[PDB]
Every structure is written in structure tokens, then in C-alpha cells.
Design a protein around this ligand. Structure first.
Ligand code: ADP
Ligand code: ADP
Ligand code: ADP
Ligand code: ADP
Ligand code: BEF
Ligand code: BEF
Ligand code: BEF
Ligand code: BEF
Ligand code: MG
Ligand code: MG
Ligand code: MG
Ligand code: MG
Lengths: 187, 370, 316, 370, 370
């Protein structure tokens, strides 16, 4: 295993939050948007993402949002959004770092398979964890990381820009038979 | 299914994609009453639309909300779209994508307000705005040709080769069946008969639609009508009285081949077609010359395909064959072609979608529909 | 993007925020970079004072090639005691900050430019020594070959700047030569890397780009680096050599050339990843045309007319 | 004193050799009236020429007898020369020798008819037909340079070194201020204004002089125009209607750098200039890059010298300085150059004398003029 | 069976060793659509190559990837090899060893890169890169002779005696059938026919093939055609327009004998052949004049054998035989000669094999090939 700070990416329907484990805020919080065109072929190099891709609607690019209802649903756009996140903004080397990715509880297996083959074959990252996003959000509640400040039982209501879901977790275990999900939120 | 709504400047032509021919064809008119509304109750309405206006016209100021293919009056154009969807097709528009159309070289704002009203008033789930002379080429069973579309308000040429349009060679002319109607009033005035009002303009349109024809050789037809009874015939008005006409029957259509009659400086439709072919790259010109496609209701005059082939064969080099393609259903070919297009499986990827409009704003049509 | 930025974007954006801010908040931020480098940005004594610090495994070599005099020249009053666990550190005070928005902009740029300012020291040592040899060779053109021969072995820089690389460079009176002993360890990047390195050499041999440095390539080392530590010929390394002539580092160009040559291997590493993103969009185009070859096996039947949401419909 | 007469595709510039500006500058136009002449007398003429036809343009079908520097209508062209000598300059041409001009790569028949009309109808005692982009270099006072000329009808490069032209390196491009005017009519149709009569095409030609400019970086100026109010300017039509215009101000002249806007395959004027220098023999290039003399009215757009200098600096090798030489009078410099050349004591042996035309016929011109 | 390709600078000739003529002959062209596709359902394709690009050319911008016998756009050359293998010959490149062909005095980088592509992109089992003129002696059945090869891109002499080539006496000249099309496009303008585009270039290439010839004495043929219509011909463009062609019918091929027409400073093909023979050792000249072999499509002009025999007889000493062997198959004689060489029993040891390439890299090619 490598020792380097795992890279953390919460790709929301509204905002991607990017950073490195153990920092006190995300390195970036910007919209999950990609600006694309609508004798060598380069229309897959000319794109932009995040706050730098809102500036591009007037320059004749088409903005599209590759995550809808909490799920990735354009895989061409999401692969280009990740390469640009890793190599422009996070400026990291994937072969050195473990990655934490996030998805909603009721995502299809096909989206975890596509996420895994993009991470391991396109970027070649050292290793990957695809966390169910509201299971993590309980751990933001603690007053500190230390074992006496933890409270490992609580319902967690998550509501972003694209999905709301309620996850019960008790004694550190996710009660998966009881998850509720509703694709109605901030958007 | 998806609606195809060819809101032309003289007739709305509407129906469902993959249906054989348009099922809602009616005047692109809104009528408003002009008289003392004396009898209380009586089922009176503040305005009437389409065939409901055309049948009441003796008490209405009829006005088309659309002129030269440009919407001039949106408060009445919404009234025509509302009549189309809820009264004539009897659908809910929030359930079906609409393929709309417009003529080339229109204002940008026409195309914007026409997408905005479809998404914000008619709440439509997805929509698209095809160029009318591209649609007319699907309806011909072709992927190369030069469509001459001519309607009530606009005449235009769009040359296409192997499915590529040559947009530098597009010709628009703001002359079509309404100018021929206004000219028929100006020449009927010379025989004895005065037509003046917006309702009387429909009586002379109903003359133009069945008495007029295109002369194959105008200057010899003119001498023949000036020396024989055979070219004259008569039409019976709503007031039962008879109108007899002669050289007016072919002087009216001739305005298309000689726009100098209505004071325009321009080429006629024959020389406008040749000026579009001669703007194209030299290797495609043979396959345009063998595939001129007539479309729209102004191309329905008896003998116009024979005349058009004569005048283009005189302009073109004599070395090569000219064909004018003029089906009997060319009356509706822009709708027919939209009904092909809106049913092609790749087309379902090309719609502006509701969600995409909400996020992008009304300028999305400029970076998706051409 | 077609080519990498030279500076760390995060430190540029972050300092562009705090230099504009009316009311700074505290921060504690480790921030990775290419070539195994790592920054730490934090506000340890006050929200008013930002400490930026850098960690880089080859910094002990870079101190031999004169780095501290270059960093003291650039950062001046802002230089600070190295933070424990970091090689270099700078303390910038947001109340003692420069006056104009273009001073703030160029200071936020300069501090984000730290990786290429610390890794520039052996290049400035080579460029400034080539300027001495260029004058000595202009004093005696028959002595000049012997000055080049001794500078080729005595004035050579080597930096083990990451564990699968070495940059080796030396001055001679008309050039600085720099050699990248470059390796891709990830086997799918090694397979594409052969194409990307080969087509890079074959590109220099065309009329359009003759103005560029003379690039050369092999896989054994150039004769003047065959006995440097860590250079080994058999271990499936490739040895991309750039010859920078006096016209590639003239005074207007030096800073862009230093910034642009350091990022070499990182553009190939980025473009190998960004070529998988291309091949995929070109593969799913051919899949979408094989669909047509299967579609001619479905018998023709009209699927029934439906509303936009797929619910059934009753007209036509 | 000899006459000097630049027979331009858009303006005839004419005057006397040794004067420092043209004496006559007027539209290269003939116009015939297109309406019912109901009123007897009233000063009416069967055809109007130059500034008469420009003043009366609302009643006339204007046409240019020049297309792309070639005389396409000789009967209209004799009227322009007759008007130039007898009405505009007011001198009998039978007494005064004349320097005419034309672009390179013209048909030889153009030059033969032009010299025949000048001897055989105007009885000019001696005449000459200079290449326009050689005259421009006399006006600048140089022996070495590459002359970029762009007018109403043509654009061309001729590189000249120490007084020798390199005729293999001449590049000609039939894109100029007429095609930019027809393109400005096209893009004004998207803002909502329709200009179509040949009299209205002159209003679009006037908007082009007073509002258009060259965007130093086109895609940055598009992004700025689409996100600002401050790009826009407004123009009073002859009607007193006010139009307003925006990103259409620089998209028009940018056609010179992107001929694909008007559907052409050609490289833009920056690349057809560089492709002329790179067709020269190697040692002269360094002196051509420092002497890019611009000329002709299409080079008057604000910012064209800066965009041209920025673009050629991006093509050319970086170790040498580009200089686009844009005189303040460059508009007339082909005529100013003719006013020098016709005056030079060393040139006055090079005329075609009418005695030579009398023995050799119009084929004299090819063996006496470049 | 081995493959053999003459990757011509204007036609690809490709086939299998032991056939009497090329299996596939097609333009060495790649074309990309210049216009926008408006039709859906059409098979829109991002590039066309060979005969499909030549057939669709009215909507394409056409590029040749080989310039003067040097490959200058490798991506569009890899497309052409993929077209030769998978579409035209329709055999996988891994199955057959393959003879490629190259002009003398090319860049070393051209033949290395053409080796590296064939072994590492097309994975071929073995290949060899013969000099185009050395194959013309195999086709002509000789072992002593001076070749005069002339294609689309290049013209060259390789003098050979008893199979020993004299590489110090090779003369190579970057003037051949492309520069004759470029010059014919230029001089066609002097009669008024403007051809400009990369597709109109392919009409002017066809005019050059159908109508041109080499006149046995140019000053005499000029004085003939200046008096008379008897030397003129007419060609119908794909537009049905007829052009008619005068002394430019033979002033075009004279560029081979007078390169100063296209501004370049070099000996014409007559003097460059005589200079190649005069560089050779004095005992062999007496046989090189007797075995002078022509090849390549630019040697196909009517009368070029008689022009070339007349000029060499004026240069060379009168006491000995000048005998020029221009055979009737000479259009393909490089390929025909390659199909003989690759078929020899003694050549099968001379291939560069894959196992022998990858122990040495592409620099193997310079130490097995000429
Ligand atoms: N103060 C607020 N009140 C309400 N909504 C807010 C507020 N601040 C942000 N939002 C909304 O939060 C959503 C983004 O939340 P986020 O957790 O980042 O969602 P996601 O992960 O799905 O992208 C957006 O709808 C945004 O407008
Ligand atoms: N038989 C006909 N003869 C002549 N004109 C006709 C005929 N049929 C229709 N028209 C004319 O065609 C015009 C309507 O054609 P249409 O293509 O529907 O125009 P638009 O699309 O602009 O609404 C009207 O002017 C109408 O009078
Ligand atoms: N100030 C100007 N700004 C832009 N274009 C101009 C300007 N003045 C003239 N032009 C254009 O230049 C052309 C006339 O240039 P000119 O050199 O006289 O051409 P020509 O010699 O062929 O007649 C016209 O198209 C005209 O509109
Ligand atoms: N019959 C012909 N008459 C004159 N020119 C010809 C003839 N046939 C071909 N050409 C010209 O010869 C060239 C093609 O010859 P080729 O030997 O195939 O050249 P390459 O090998 O370099 O591609 C083209 O320029 C073509 O127009
Ligand atoms: F996609 Be967000 F999490 F709703
Ligand atoms: F509006 Be119709 F097509 F003239
Ligand atoms: F005829 Be102008 F010089 F274009
Ligand atoms: F190959 Be061609 F003969 F240049
Ligand atoms: Mg979320
Ligand atoms: Mg219509
Ligand atoms: Mg001019
Ligand atoms: Mg050849």
C-alpha cells in the first residue's frame, strides 16, 4: 500500500467537492458541469469544467451536467471531468494515491463497474473506495475524529442538488434493508 | 409520437409524425369583430381563429399574425398555436415533442421566441426547429437537390448535395402567394371589380387558387387572350353575382417569373434558382440541375413545372438535362418531410429537451437546431 | 486542456481569494503535486499570516546546485524557517501585503510558481555558465573544444527528481543539453509511451518545427552520461535528449524555457491518460455503427404511438 | 500632363499626373430607371452614371460594369470613361495620354478590349496599363516590398525586390469589399433587417465603412460581444429609421481572415500573404517581411494593420521583425502611384503610342505592359 | 506472393508480385467535408480517401499527403495505406511481404518513418524500399540505361551500367505533373477561366491529361497557334459549360523544358538528362545515350519522345546514336518493374524481415536498400 493522503471526490449532481484526506475543507467546490463544442481531431481536448466552464457559455460551448439524480449518466463527459479534475485542479498522480469516490445508495451496479474501469484502466489509480454518500455524512457530525467523540448510531438525512436519501446506521453498521431514496432535491 | 407543426404564414399545417398527411390544415388567421355587438348572449367570442374566423369573415377584421415567414404579433400567434393543439388536434401539448419549422435567413429572435413560447406557454416536453427547404427534400425521397419552397409569404432555395447544405448559396425572396393575392386585387380593379377589405382579400385568394394558371410563353399568351374568348372564364361570389376574368388569370402568377410587376427589383423564381445553382461548387451543379424540387402551395399553378423547366433550360448550358420534380402532394411537402424526420431514430437524439432548455435558456436553439 | 499549467492552480486561486478578502478565515491544507511533490498551506499563528511550505525528495541535491540563493532572490523578506517535515517554507502576511491589484496578482502567481522556482536552480547554473563559456570560446576558438570537453564532465548537473526518472544537463559554449532518463512503470502507459516517445522524435524531423530544440532518443544513454549514478542502460528506460541552443534560452525566452522543459514528462504522462479518453470516444463510435449491422436483423414492425413519457396514446 | 485613371471595381479614381490626390472619385456605377416615367421632361435621362446614379438611387436599378477587376459590361463601361473625361475631369482625352490600371491574372481579352476602346473611340494619343500593385509601391517610395492590395473587387499580393516582381509568387483572391458587403447583407438578416434592392445594398456598403472594424482576436471578441452592451453601435438609415448592430461589426471584416464565412475554400489574406513570401527565393524573404505595404480601400478597417501584423508574426520565424506598412492615405495609393509613374522622365519612353496600336492592333499591349 | 506499392506522389499504384499491371490505381488523395450535414440518416463520414474522395469532391477540401515525393502529412498517408490494404487490395498487411517504392535523394527520415509505420503500425512480415528509377529498368528489360522518371511530384534521372548505378550522377528535380497543373490553372486565367479550389484543380488535372501535348519546337508552334484556330480544342466541364483552349494546350508541358516559366532556376528535363550523362564515366556515355528509358505519367504527353530526342541530339555529340525508349505501358512501369523485382528467385533473400528490423531499429533500411 502507498502512504500518500487518499484523494476524496464527492461528485454531486450540483457540485463536485474535491480534496485530500485530513484537510479542514475541500480544495475545490464547483459545479459538476462540462463545457464542450456544439486537421487533427481535438474536440475532446477543448473542454472545460467547474467554475471555469460557466465562463464558456458565451464563447459558444454547450454546458452539460454529467450527473443527474445523483447518478453518473454520461460516461464520456464524466471521464473527461475526472481527467481534468485529477490533472488540472488536484494536480496529482493517480498511480501514487488511493481514491475515495461517492455515489447514492440505489445506484445501478453498471455505474460502479464503469467507475471502476475508468479509474483502473484510464487513470491507473493505486486503489479505489466507492462510498455510499450518506454513510459518510454521519462522520461529519462528530466534534472530533477521536473515539470518545463518536456517536455511531443515528438516522442520516442527505439532500443535495439531485437526490435525497435517508440512511439509518446503528453501532457503525448501515441498516441496508431500510434505506429510503427520493430523486427530488435542490435542482 | 411527436407533433409536426408547420406554422406557415398562410396555412397552419399540423399533425403527427409518421401520419400520411397533415390532419389540421387551416388559415394562419386571427379574426376580431368590427361591429356593434347588439344581441346579448348569443355565444359571442372576443376573437376567432382559423376556419372558425374564415367562415365568419363578413363581420371580422382578419389578420395573419405572421408576415413573410416572420412572426409579427405573438399575442395572436399563441392564439393560433393554442387553437392548433387544443381545438384542431385536441391533444395536450405537454405530452408530445413538437417539430416546428422556419424559412432560412429569418431573424434570430423569431427562432428564440418560438422556442420560448413552446417551452414556457405550451409546456412542451422537447422541440426542434427544422429549415423548411430541408424538410421538403426528405418529402421528395432524395438527399441532393435544390428545393424551391414557396408558400404564402416566402420563396426560398436551399441547394443540397449528399446531405450537406451549401448555406452560402441559399436564396431568400420575400415574394409568394400573398403578394400574388395583393396583385390580383390591383389588376381585378382594372376590369370592373373592387375588392378592398381583409375579408374580400380571401375571396380573391379563392379566385387565385382555382382560376389562375402559368403561361408557358407569356408574351404570346397575352396576344391570344387579347384576341379570343377561350382564355376567359367566370367565378360566382358569396353575394351570388358573377366575376368574369381573362388575361388576369396568367398575369397574376407571372409576377413570380417577373417580380418587376409588383415594383420589386429581383430575379424571378427561375433565375433565383439558377443564381443558387451557380453559387455552388462546380462538381455538384449537374446533380442540382437534375433535381430541382418544387414545394409549397404557390407552386400549385397549372403549367408552372413546364414553365420552370423551360426558363431554367434557357439559363442552364444546353449540354445537360434539367428536371423539375413537382409531385401532386407538393401542397404539403414541408409537413410530409417533417413527418418523416420526426420519426427517424437518430432524430430522437436531436430534440431540445425541457430540462436542457431550463438549464441553457432560449439561446439553446442557436447551438442545436443549425 | 492541450498543455499543462506550470504553477499549482490551488495556491494561485487560494492566494487570489485571501489577497482580495476583507476578512480572512484560518486554513490547514496539504496539497499534492506532480513528481511526488507536496505543499502544505496553513495559518499557524494567526488567520492574518499564511505559511506555504514545500516537500520534495530531491531538494538536498537542488541545494548543492545553488537553490537557496535563487529562492532568497525571489521571495526575499517572506522566507521563513523550514516547517518540520518540509524542505522550504515562506510566511506571507496579509496586512503587510503589497499595494496594487497587479502586485497582488504577480505575488499570488510567484508563490504558486514555487515548484518550478525550486527546480529551476540547476537550469540557471547551466545557462549562466554557458554565458561564461560563450565568452571564453569567443576569446579562443581553438581552446573552445577543450573547455566544452571539461565542462561536459565537470559542470554536469544530475537530479534524481523522481524515482523512475533522472534529468541530466550540462553547459557547452553554444548550448545547454538536457537528457531525461524517462520510464513509464504502469504497463498500459509503457505500451502507449513507446508510441508517444517515438512520434515525439519523428515530429522534430519535419520542416514545420525546425525552430525547436534538437530532440534525440535511444534505449542506450548518450556517451557523456554513461557513468552517472542511477542511469542504467538495460532497465527499459528511454533517454530523450534536448539540445537547447543559444536561441532557445535568449533573455526573453529563459523563464518560459525553464518552465516548459521541466513539465516535459508530465505532458506525456497527461497525454497518455487523455489518449485513453480519446480512444474510448472513437471506440463507442464504431460500436454505434455495428448497431446498424445488427438492426437489419430485426423484422420491421411499428412500435405503437406513445406520449413523451412512454404512456400509450390514441390519435392517428 | 498625362491622365491617370484607376478603373476600380467600386470607385473610379482619376486625375492628372503630378497632382498629389485624385481629382475625381466616384462610384463605378451605371443606373437605369425602373419605374413608370409619368411626367413629361422634368430633366429625365435614359441612364445615370456615378454620383448622379448614387444621388437618385431610390429610383434606379444600379449595376457595376466591373466584377472582380474584369469589365463584364462594355457598353456601361464606355459611359463611365466618357463621364470621367468629359463630365468629371472636363478634358478632351484626344489631347492627353492616359495611364490605366488592372489587377494581375486578368483575362488578356479584358486588356485588349480596354486598349482598343481607349484608342479607337476616345482617340487617346498614347496610353499604358499598369499592374495596380506595382503602382502602390511607387506611392510608398520603395523598391522592396510585398504589396497587399484589396479593393472592391479583388485582393492580390505581388512581392517585388529591388524593382523586380516575382510573377510566380503573385497570389490573387477574388474576395474584396463587394463580397464583404453581400456578406454584411446576409448577417444583417439575422438581426432582423432586410436589405435586398441594389439601392439598399449601397446602404449596407455605407454601414460597412462607418461601423465595421477588425477584431484583433476574433473568438475573444465574440465572447466579449455575446456578454456585453458596449460593443454595439447604431446607424440612421436614409429613412430616419435607426438600426443597431453588434458582433456583426467584426464578423464582416473577419471574412478576410476566414474566407469560409462566404463559403470559399481559400486561405485568408494573412496566409495568402505568407504563402506569397514563402513562394519567393529565400534571400529576399527577410526584406519582404519588413515591407508589407498595404493598399486599396478594403484595408481601411480600424485594427486591420494590428490583426495582420499579429497573424503574420504567428506564421513567420520568430527571430525577425514583421512590419505591416499602412499609410494614412493608403485608400488612394494605387492612384497616387500612377500619378508618380506617369510623371517619371524615365517612364515617358514606355507609353503605347497610337502609331504602335495602328501597326500592331490591340495585341500591342502584352508586349509593352507587364 | 509479395505486395508491391508505388506510393506515387499523385496516384497510388498497388498490387501483387507476378501480375502484369497494378490491381488498384487510385488518386493519392484524402478529403474532408467543408460544409455542414443537414440530412439525418445519411452515412456522414469524417474523411474520404482515394476514388471516393475524387467522386464526392464537390463538397470536400482535398489534400495530397505526398509533396515532391516526400510524405508531408503522415496521418493522411497512414489512411491511404489502410485504404490500400483493407479496402482496395482487401488483404491483411500481416500476410504478405511488401515492396514499397521511393524517389532518389529523399530525406533519410522519410524512408525510416515509412519503415517504422510498416513494421509497428501495419505489422508487415517483411518489406523493402526500392528506388523508383531502378524499377523502370526491370520493367524495360534492361541492365544498362539512363532512366528519366517523371510523376506527379518529382522528376529524376538514375544512370545505370551493367546493373551498377552511378549515385554521384543522379539528377533530381522537384518539377513534375503537379506543378504543371498549378501552372495550367494560372495560364487558364489568361483566357478567362478561373479555377481556384482543390476540386477545380482535379478538373484542370483532367484537362491536362485529355488535351495537352509537347510541341516539337515552341517558338514555331507559338507562331502557328497565334495565326489560327487549328490547334485549339474544347473540353466540357462537369458543369456542362465548354471551355476552349489555345496555345496553353502546349505552353503547359513546355514547363518541363523551360522551368523558368514557373520562376524556378533549373535545367529543363533535356539538359538535366544530358548533365546526368556527362557526369557519368566517359566509356559508359556511349551506351547511356542508346538506352534512355522514360517512366511515370508526366512522360505521357504526345510528342514528348520526339521533343526529348530532338533536344538530346542537339546537346550530345552528333557522331553517335541517341535512342529513347518510351514504352506504351510506361504510365505504370515503376510498379510493373517492382512486380518483376519482388518475383525474382534471387530477391527473396534481400527483404528487410521483421525479426531483422527490431534488433536494429528503422536505421536498418539504409544498409539493405539503395
Ligand atoms: N443556504 C442554502 N439554502 C438552500 N439551498 C442551498 C443553500 N446553500 C446551497 N444550497 C443548495 O445546495 C445544493 C448543493 O448541495 P450539494 O450538497 O453540494 O448537492 P450535491 O452533492 O448533490 O451536488 C444546491 O441545490 C444549492 O443551491
Ligand atoms: N391551387 C393553388 N393554386 C395557386 N395557389 C395556391 C394553390 N393552392 C394553394 N395556393 C396558395 O398557396 C399559399 C399557401 O401555401 P403554403 O405552402 O401552405 O404556404 P405557407 O407554408 O407559407 O403557409 C396561399 O397563397 C394559397 O392561396
Ligand atoms: N473607410 C473604409 N472602411 C472600410 N471599407 C472601406 C472604406 N472606404 C472604402 N472601403 C471599401 O473599399 C472598397 C473600395 O476600395 P477601392 O480601393 O477604391 O477599390 P477599387 O480600386 O477596386 O475600386 C469598397 O468596397 C468600399 O466599401
Ligand atoms: N495521359 C497523360 N497525359 C499527361 N499527363 C498524364 C497522363 N496520365 C497521367 N498524367 C499525369 O501524371 C501524373 C501521375 O503520374 P504517376 O506516374 O502516377 O505519378 P506518381 O507516381 O508520382 O503518382 C499526374 O500529374 C497526371 O495528371
Ligand atoms: F447529487 Be447531489 F448529492 F444530490
Ligand atoms: F410561410 Be409560408 F411558407 F410562406
Ligand atoms: F477593382 Be478594385 F481594385 F478591387
Ligand atoms: F511517385 Be511520383 F512519380 F512522384
Ligand atoms: Mg450530494
Ligand atoms: Mg410554407
Ligand atoms: Mg482597386
Ligand atoms: Mg511515381
Amino acid at each position: 500500500a502507498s502512504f500518500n493522503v487518499p484523494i476524496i471526490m464527492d461528485n454531486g449532481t450540483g457540485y463536485s467537492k474535491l480534496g485530500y484526506a485530513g484537510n479542514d475543507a475541500p480544495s475545490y467546490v464547483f459545479p459538476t458541469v462540462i463545457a464542450t463544442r456544439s486537421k487533427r481531431a481535438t474536440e475532446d481536448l477543448d473542454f472545460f469544467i467547474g467554475n471555469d466552464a460557466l465562463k464558456k457559455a458565451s464563447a459558444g460551448y454547450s454546458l452539460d451536467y454529467p450527473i443527474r439524480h445523483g447518478q453518473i449518466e454520461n460516461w464520456d463527459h464524466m471521464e473527461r471531468f475526472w481527467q481534468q479534475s485529477l490533472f488540472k485542479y488536484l494536480r496529482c498522480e493517480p498511480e501514487d494515491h488511493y481514491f475515495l469516490l461517492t455515489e447514492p445508495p440505489l445506484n445501478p451496479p453498471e455505474n460502479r463497474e464503469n467507475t471502476a474501469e475508468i479509474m483502473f484502466e484510464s487513470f491507473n489509480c493505486a486503489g479505489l473506495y466507492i462510498a455510499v454518500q450518506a454513510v459518510l455524512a454521519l462522520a461529519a457530525s462528530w466534534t472530533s475524529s477521536k473515539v470518545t467523540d463518536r456517536s455511531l448510531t443515528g438516522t442520516v438525512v442527505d439532500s443535495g442538488d439531485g437526490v435525497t436519501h435517508i440512511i439509518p446506521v446503528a453501532e457503525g453498521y448501515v441498516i441496508g434493508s431500510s434505506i429510503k431514496t427520493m430523486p427530488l432535491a435542490g435542482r | 409520437t411527436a407533433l409536426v407543426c408547420d406554422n406557415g404564414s398562410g396555412l397552419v399545417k399540423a399533425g403527427f409524425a409518421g401520419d400520411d398527411a397533415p390532419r389540421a390544415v387551416f388559415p394562419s388567421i386571427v379574426g376580431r369583430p368590427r361591429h356593434q355587438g347588439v344581441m346579448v348572449g348569443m355565444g359571442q367570442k372576443d376573437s376567432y381563429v382559423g376556419d372558425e374566423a374564415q367562415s365568419k369573415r363578413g363581420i371580422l377584421t382578419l389578420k395573419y399574425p405572421i408576415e413573410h415567414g416572420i412572426i409579427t404579433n405573438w399575442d395572436d400567434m399563441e392564439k393560433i398555436w393554442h387553437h392548433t393543439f387544443y381545438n384542431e388536434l385536441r391533444v395536450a401539448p405537454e405530452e408530445h415533442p413538437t417539430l416546428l419549422t422556419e424559412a432560412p435567413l429569418n431573424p434570430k429572435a423569431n427562432r428564440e421566441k418560438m422556442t420560448q413560447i413552446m417551452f414556457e406557454t405550451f409546456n412542451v416536453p422537447a422541440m426542434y426547429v427544422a429549415i423548411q427547404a430541408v424538410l421538403s427534400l426528405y418529402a421528395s425521397g432524395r438527399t441532393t437537390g435544390i428545393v424551391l419552397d414557396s408558400g404564402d409569404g416566402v420563396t426560398h432555395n436551399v441547394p443540397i448535395y449528399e446531405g450537406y447544405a451549401l448555406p452560402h448559396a441559399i436564396m431568400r425572396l420575400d415574394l409568394a402567394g400573398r403578394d400574388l393575392t395583393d396583385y390580383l386585387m390591383k389588376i381585378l380593379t382594372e376590369r370592373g371589380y373592387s375588392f378592398v377589405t381583409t375579408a374580400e382579400r380571401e375571396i380573391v385568394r379563392d379566385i387565385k387558387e382555382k382560376l389562375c394558371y402559368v403561361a408557358l410563353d407569356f408574351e404570346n399568351e397575352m396576344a391570344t387572350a387579347a384576341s379570343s374568348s377561350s382564355l376567359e372564364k367566370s367565378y360566382e361570389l358569396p353575394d351570388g353575382q358573377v366575376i368574369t376574368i381573362g388575361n388576369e388569370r396568367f398575369r397574376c402568377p407571372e409576377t413570380l417569373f417577373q417580380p418587376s410587376f409588383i415594383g420589386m427589383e429581383s430575379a424571378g423564381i427561375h433565375e433565383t434558382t439558377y443564381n443558387s445553382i451557380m453559387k455552388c461548387d462546380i462538381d455538384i451543379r449537374k446533380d442540382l440541375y437534375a433535381n430541382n424540387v418544387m414545394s409549397g402551395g404557390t407552386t400549385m399553378y397549372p403549367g408552372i413545372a413546364d414553365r420552370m423547366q423551360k426558363e431554367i433550360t434557357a439559363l442552364a448550358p444546353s449540354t445537360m438535362k434539367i428536371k423539375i420534380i413537382a409531385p401532386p402532394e407538393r401542397k404539403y411537402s414541408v409537413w410530409i418531410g417533417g413527418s418523416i424526420l420526426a420519426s427517424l431514430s437518430t432524430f430522437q437524439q436531436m430534440w431540445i429537451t425541457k430540462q436542457e432548455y431550463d438549464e441553457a435558456g432560449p439561446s439553446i436553439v442557436h447551438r442545436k437546431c443549425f | 486542456m492541450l498543455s499543462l499549467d506550470y504553477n499549482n492552480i490551488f495556491i494561485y486561486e487560494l492566494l487570489t481569494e485571501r489577497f482580495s478578502s476583507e476578512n480572512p478565515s484560518s486554513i490547514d491544507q496539504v496539497v499534492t503535486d506532480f513528481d511526488g511533490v507536496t505543499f502544505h498551506i496553513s495559518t499557524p499563528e494567526e488567520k492574518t499570516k499564511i505559511l506555504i511550505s514545500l516537500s520534495m525528495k530531491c531538494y538536498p541535491e537542488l541545494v548543492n546546485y545553488g537553490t537557496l540563493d535563487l529562492l532568497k532572490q525571489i521571495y526575499g523578506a517572506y522566507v521563513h524557517e523550514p516547517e518540520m517535515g518540509y524542505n522550504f517554507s515562506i510566511l506571507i502576511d496579509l496586512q503587510q501585503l503589497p499595494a496594487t491589484d497587479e502586485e497582488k496578482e504577480q505575488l499570488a502567481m510567484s508563490i504558486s510558481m514555487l515548484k518550478r522556482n525550486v527546480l529551476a536552480a540547476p537550469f540557471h547554473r547551466a545557462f549562466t555558465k554557458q554565458a561564461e563559456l560563450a565568452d571564453l570560446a569567443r576569446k579562443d576558438p581553438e581552446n573552445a573544444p577543450m573547455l566544452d570537453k571539461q565542462a561536459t564532465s565537470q559542470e554536469l548537473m544530475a537530479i534524481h527528481y523522481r524515482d523512475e526518472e533522472t534529468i541530466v544537463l550540462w553547459p557547452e559554449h553554444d548550448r545547454v543539453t538536457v537528457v531525461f532518463s524517462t520510464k513509464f512503470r504502469e504497463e498500459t502507459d509503457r505500451i502507449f509511451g513507446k508510441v508517444f516517445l517515438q512520434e515525439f522524435v519523428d515530429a522534430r524531423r519535419r520542416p514545420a518545427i525546425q525552430t525547436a530544440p534538437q530532440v534525440l532518443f535511444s534505449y542506450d544513454p548518450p556517451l557523456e552520461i554513461r557513468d552517472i549514478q542511477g542511469i542504467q542502460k538495460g532497465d527499459d528506460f528511454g533517454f530523450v535528449t534536448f539540445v537547447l541552443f543559444e536561441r532557445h534560452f535568449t533573455p526573453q525566452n529563459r523563464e518560459d524555457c525553464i518552465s516548459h522543459i521541466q513539465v516535459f514528462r508530465n505532458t506525456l504522462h497527461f497525454h497518455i491518460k487523455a489518449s485513453k479518453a480519446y480512444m474510448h470516444q472513437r471506440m463507442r463510435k464504431r460500436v454505434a455503427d455495428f448497431q446498424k449491422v445488427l438492426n437489419r436483423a430485426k423484422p420491421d414492425v411499428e412500435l405503437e404511438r406513445k406520449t413523451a413519457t412512454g404512456r400509450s396514446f390514441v390519435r392517428a
